[PDB]
């Protein structure tokens, strides 16, 4: 009936398309008609082993919007995790957790008993909640998730966000991908092979202007200056920023998305344009995260 009831949300590879369709649908329903007391008398643990105020605020806001109570912590920048989860799983009904070590949310699953574990990212490995809000935003703005022109710009080598989003969009039909990134930060091979094994169209491009005419989604990522030397950064950065003057060829339906925060990637003149949707994207985070929590903590969701 609801295959996500009391199940853990760890990886985007673990979610089938059938599962993704359910989460998206529940998000849209909760957005249209609130359910302020859907999780009354429920206690959720906001366990941010690696501090992230951006992510914690959105998650905990979603928790309260469903009338749930929140307890948690945010550790500073520096007992086994098994013991910790073994203890906390006796306190609470659900565990949203962010951890600096890959696979930690999975390890929590093996010690939480029947307390479901939601991953708020385990460093380089996974970040499913960000992808689900990304999907719901693309779907709301394009009317669909199939047969779309999706461009991904920035640090495609180290972006956990874009690997999950490409993986997730590859479970939908007729999507053409445009990867615009410097060679030292190119999309990894295992992602491209994944696209080829499903016969999905993808192309590489040196700049955004090359593709601007034929894109429905432009997905900007934050190129961290630490991944290259400031010299190599300066040489290549010019081809991967976005100014409003670059949006003349853009389609009327096209939207600009960004996980956030933006430093130099997106010039501030874009915010005025109707293609700016990165803040509405973040705003959609609550509904994606409301849906995820609700589906996991109730068997029958009478909607």
């Amino acid at each position: 009936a609801n295959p996500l009831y009391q199940k853990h949300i760890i990886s985007i590879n673990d979610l089938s398309r059938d599962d993704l369709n359910l989460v998206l649908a529940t998000a849209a329903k909760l957005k249209a008609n609130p359910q302020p007391e859907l999780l009354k008398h429920k206690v959720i643990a906001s366990c941010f082993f690696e501090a992230s105020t951006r992510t914690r605020l959105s998650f905990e806001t979603s928790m309260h919007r469903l009338g749930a109570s929140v307890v948690g912590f945010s550790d500073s920048a520096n007992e086994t995790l098994a013991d910790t989860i073994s203890v906390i799983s006796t306190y609470v009904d659900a565990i949203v957790m962010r951890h600096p070590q890959e696979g930690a949310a999975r390890l929590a699953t093996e010690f939480s008993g029947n307390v479901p574990v939601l991953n708020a990212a385990d460093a380089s490995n996974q970040h499913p909640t960000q992808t689900l809000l990304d999907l719901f935003t693309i779907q709301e703005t394009q009317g669909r998730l199939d047969n779309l022109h999706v461009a991904m710009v920035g640090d495609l080598k180290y972006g956990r966000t874009v690997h999950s989003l490409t993986q997730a969009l590859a479970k939908f039909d007729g999507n053409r991908f445009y990867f615009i990134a410097p060679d030292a930060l190119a999309m990894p091979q295992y992602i491209l092979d994944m696209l080829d094994e499903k016969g999905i169209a993808w192309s590489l491009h040196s700049s955004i202007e090359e593709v601007m005419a034929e894109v429905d989604i432009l997905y900007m990522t934050r190129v961290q200056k630490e991944r290259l030397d400031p010299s190599e950064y300066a040489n290549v950065k010019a081809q991967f920023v976005l100014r409003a003057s670059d949006l003349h060829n853009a389609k009327a339906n096209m939207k600009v998305l960004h996980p956030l925060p933006r430093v130099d990637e997106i010039a501030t003149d874009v915010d005025k344009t109707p293609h700016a949707w990165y803040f509405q994207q973040a705003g959609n985070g609550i509904f994606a995260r409301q849906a995820l929590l609700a589906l996991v903590l109730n068997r029958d969701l009478v909607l």
Partner: protein, 134 residues
């Protein structure tokens, strides 16, 4: 000295970068003319070949004559110099030049489709498009 055939949106750039309005001489300017060109006319001041050369990166195919003696005294087109100082900024943010009271300096050399600019300090080479973008 008079400068002819300045490209569009390079006249005010030259006045700003080269501080031409920081004098007491008679200065005359014109922007967007028949050719959309720009024109700078300044009385009783002589530019050496280096200052004309320093205009090559911004106004390459331009002319620099002299008319302070009521006649066309000298002819001059801007050739590309070996060094460009005091106007360019190093795109390398970690360059010591930025914080300190020195003059920026870049060595020039021609490539195919490109012009390499090597900083005097951080010894890093950039395409002129990257240096001029900021």
């Amino acid at each position: 000295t008079v400068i002819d055939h300045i490209p569009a949106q390079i006249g005010f750039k030259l006045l700003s970068l080269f501080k031409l309005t920081e004098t007491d001489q008679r200065i005359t300017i014109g922007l967007n003319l028949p050719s959309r060109k720009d024109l700078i006319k300044i009385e009783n001041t002589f530019l050496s070949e280096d200052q004309v050369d320093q205009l090559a990166l911004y106004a390459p195919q331009a002319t620099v004559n002299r008319i302070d003696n009521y006649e066309v005294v000298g002819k001059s087109r801007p050739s590309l110099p070996e060094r460009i100082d005091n106007v360019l900024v190093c795109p390398n943010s970690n360059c010591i030049s930025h914080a300190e009271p020195v003059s920026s300096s870049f060595a020039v050399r021609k490539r195919a489709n490109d012009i390499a600019l090597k900083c005097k300090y951080c010894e890093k080479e950039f395409s002129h498009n990257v240096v001029l973008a900021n």
